[PDB]
Design a protein around this ligand. Structure first.
Ligand SMILES: NC(=O)C1=CN([C@@H]2O[C@H](COP(=O)(O)OP(=O)(O)OC[C@H]3O[C@@H](n4cnc5c(N)ncnc54)[C@H](O)[C@@H]3O)[C@@H](O)[C@H]2O)C=CC1
Ligand SMILES: N[C@@H](CCCCNC(=O)[C@H]1CCC=N1)C(=O)O
Ligand SMILES: [Mg+2]
Ligand code: NA
Length: 259
């Protein structure tokens, strides 16, 4: 388990703007366009109730405020409830929320009360970041390297397999790698025998997970992982096109998936 810190979420609007610019450079589409390609949906000022939750480690500084900003950015009529938890849920529904957005330490969900669709942050984040990686316009290859095969990584890899990409996967935990290979049919990546990729998807709570020998010039690294999968030095050396943002892209994926 690795949760967001208040420091991760400083100037969320600038982080989102930069991420959107990067996604547009890499794919030719903005985040809205990516969500449109994934789900066929667009926002129509749907009312979104954001409920703070005191469960477990409790309320995270900047979390609800960031969700407030993210939802407004994508054109939703969002609000944050005064009360937390069940009282907050009640408040949200009474105040006309169509979509409920809330998170404890284990689950971050979006529930559309109008159509009954419900999203989980983990697969939604994996899918969108993998989708963005795969749409790299100057890729020249359908080989994709997936580093990290957990809650976010596995559904990302699954998506890429469904989208007919040649998926190579690595996880430091042998069992997780074996599970991904036997359930998805991905190619197990051997770090001792590396090849260069133009498309990399990483979902790990660790730094320096992308070895130099894997990088090619101008390669895309699409990663929700925190901290950054690659050092500044390696990122600069190979002019890596980085898509990395702490909350907004995954939240967009959730919201557009329930429309
Ligand atoms: N930016 C965003 O919007 C979001 C970010 N996150 C962040 O994404 C990260 C991943 O989340 P989950 O998939 O839920 O975590 P997880 O713990 O379910 O999966 C992480 C996997 O990475 C593997 N791993 C660790 N070090 C490695 C290395 N050096 N090489 C290869 N594999 C390695 C672990 O064995 C584990 O299987 C976390 O840092 C989390 O905080 C999570 C949700 C949304
Ligand atoms: N209950 C808290 C929110 C806890 C969210 C923890 N989940 C994560 O950190 C996920 C979300 C994206 C990256 N990891 C609150 O209401 O303030
Ligand atoms: Mg994100
Ligand atoms: Na990382």
């Amino acid at each position: 388990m690795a949760l967001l810190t208040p420091d991760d979420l400083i100037n969320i609007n600038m982080q989102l703007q930069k991420a959107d610019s990067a996604v547009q450079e890499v794919t030719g589409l903005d985040i809205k366009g990516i969500c449109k390609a994934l789900y066929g949906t667009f926002s129509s000022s749907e009312k979104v109730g954001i409920v703070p939750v005191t469960s477990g480690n409790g309320i995270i500084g900047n979390f609800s405020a960031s969700l407030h900003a993210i939802t407004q950015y994508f054109g939703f009529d969002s609000f944050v409830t005064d009360m937390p938890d069940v009282s907050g849920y009640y408040e949200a529904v009474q105040n006309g929320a169509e979509i409920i957005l809330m998170a404890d330490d284990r689950t971050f969900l979006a529930h559309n009360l109008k159509n009954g669709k419900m999203a989980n942050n983990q697969p939604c984040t994996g899918i969108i970041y993998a989708e963005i990686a795969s749409r790299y316009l100057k890729a020249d290859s359908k080989d994709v390297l997936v580093v990290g095969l957990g809650k976010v990584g596995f559904p990302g890899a699954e998506h890429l397999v469904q989208k007919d990409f040649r998926v190579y996967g690595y996880d430091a935990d042998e069992t997780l790698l074996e599970r991904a290979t036997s359930n998805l049919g991905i190619i197990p990546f051997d770090p001792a025998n590396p090849k260069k990729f133009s498309i990399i998807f990483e979902a790990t709570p660790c730094a320096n997970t992308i070895p130099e020998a894997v990088l090619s010039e101008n390669c895309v690294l699409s990663t929700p992982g925190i901290p950054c999968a690659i050092s500044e030095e390696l990122r600069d050396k190979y002019e890596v096109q980085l898509i990395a943002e702490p909350l907004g892209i995954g939240t967009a994926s959730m919201l557009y998936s329930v429309l």
